[PDB]
């Protein structure tokens, strides 16, 4: 909500990560009881570039 935290920078390459971050966002907005709330991205600890390298390691490991 306050702009771009510079930690959540998905590269122009590997833009498939957005479609998984949608599910990871919409998980907790449905698990929490009560009103489904508008949910905003806050932090990716290892960086957005190094986040999807873990997914690519899982894809090589199958």
């Amino acid at each position: 909500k306050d702009g771009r935290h510079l930690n959540t920078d998905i590269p122009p390459r590997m833009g498939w990560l957005r479609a998984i971050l949608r599910f990871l966002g919409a998980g907790m907005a449905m698990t929490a009881t009560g009103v489904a709330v508008d949910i905003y991205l806050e932090d990716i600890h290892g960086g957005g570039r190094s986040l999807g390298q873990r997914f690519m390691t899982w894809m090589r490991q199958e």
């Binding site: 510079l6 290892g46 960086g47 570039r49 190094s50």
Partner: peptide, 27 residues
Amino acid sequence: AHVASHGSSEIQRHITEFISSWQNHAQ
């Protein structure tokens, strides 16, 4: 101390390896 101890992800590795490498400058 833990608040300030967490202080571009590739430039951080570049500056860490920049700092960690050097030290110096019979009759």
